[PDB]
């Protein structure tokens, strides 16, 4: 046969969820492309990874034509 | 024989058919038909489909049509004989259609009941499914 090759998984998925606390540099979402867009106190990296900016509580709040906008409420 | 002119992929996995098909169990454009009252899914092949169609078409020579509400869309493979287990999937052997309990396969619109019962009874003897003769409510 000619079908016996595959690559290792990149362990993508959703890190700390929309009800838990994060800190100044915690990875929130690992993606391939910005499908979860950054909101307030949340920025995006080169690899479309969502990072926190300050300590607070995560909140997804999908809106604007079904587009997730992950943000952080400071506390 | 009925088969797609072309398709995206050649080999297809053999899934699991859970019965009681919730779509395709009502008569449309025909008043008589045969429906599967089996207990588990079946694979209706193109050879069986053509045999049943020609058997039902030889009866009622030129009266009415024969609607076939099914199509052999999935390919079933078979590796050659005297070959040990496992060197990849085998070549596509034939094409078949999934038939779940409740699906209607053949329909007749033109002929009356006396001829449409005999034609469908003659055609149902070529299919590997227990079939019952159904008539439309608005009749």
């Amino acid at each position: 046969s000619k079908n016996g090759r595959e690559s290792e998984s990149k362990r993508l998925g959703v890190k700390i969820y929309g009800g838990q606390a994060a800190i100044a540099g915690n990875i929130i979402v690992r993606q391939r492309g910005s499908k979860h867009n950054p909101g307030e106190n949340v920025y995006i990296s080169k690899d479309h990874t969502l990072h926190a900016r300050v300590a607070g509580v995560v909140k997804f709040q999908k809106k604007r034509d079904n587009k997730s906008y992950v943000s952080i409420i400071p506390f | 024989m009925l088969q797609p002119k072309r398709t995206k992929y050649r080999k297809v996995q053999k899934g699991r058919m859970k019965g009681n098909s919730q779509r395709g169990h009502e008569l449309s454009n025909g008043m008589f038909g045969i429906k599967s009252v089996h207990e588990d899914g079946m694979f209706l092949t193109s050879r069986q489909i053509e045999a049943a169609r020609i058997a039902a078409t030889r009866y009622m020579k030129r009266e009415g049509q024969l609607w076939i509400k099914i199509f052999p869309d999935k390919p079933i493979t078979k590796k050659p004989l005297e070959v040990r287990m496992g060197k990849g999937k085998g070549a596509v052997e034939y094409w078949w259609a999934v038939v779940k309990p409740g699906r209607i396969m053949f329909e007749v619109g033109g002929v009356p009941l006396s001829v449409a019962k005999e034609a469908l009874r003659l055609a149902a003897q070529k299919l590997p499914v227990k079939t019952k003769f159904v008539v439309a409510r608005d009749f």
Partner: protein, 124 residues
């Protein structure tokens, strides 16, 4: 033409109620179009003169304690492997709604829109 149907208002809705209702030869039906949807039950015998007939009828739903409802048959659900009726859905008519129905042609069925009292039985 017109038929009559004596039903019974359902006091409990759910899965256990529907199971205990179908374990006794009854059929749950719903009727909507007015103030609120009313759920009732038929004895599975008031039909076979409305569902299996090749004509257009109008049902007079009478719940006993209620009143005439003057419904039209709109939706039917059947079992795939037994052809038994599982659910019926009726649409109310009071005085004027320009209701749409399906009328069989007389020498399959054409869609017509007319007042509740001006519906033809067969078109030619």
């Amino acid at each position: 033409k017109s038929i009559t149907i004596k039903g019974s208002e359902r006091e409990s809705v759910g899965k256990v109620s529907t199971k205990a209702l179908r374990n006794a030869g009854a059929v749950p039906c719903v009727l909507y179009g007015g103030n609120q949807a009313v759920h009732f039950s038929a004895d599975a015998a008031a039909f076979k003169n409305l569902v299996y007939t090749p004509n257009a009828h109008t049902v007079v739903i009478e719940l006993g304690a209620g009143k005439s409802f003057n419904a039209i048959l709109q939706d039917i659900q059947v079992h795939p492997v037994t052809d038994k009726i599982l659910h019926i859905d009726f649409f109310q008519l009071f005085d004027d709604k320009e209701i749409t129905m399906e009328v069989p042609v007389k020498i399959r069925k054409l869609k017509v829109k007319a007042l509740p009292a001006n519906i033809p039985e067969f078109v030619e």
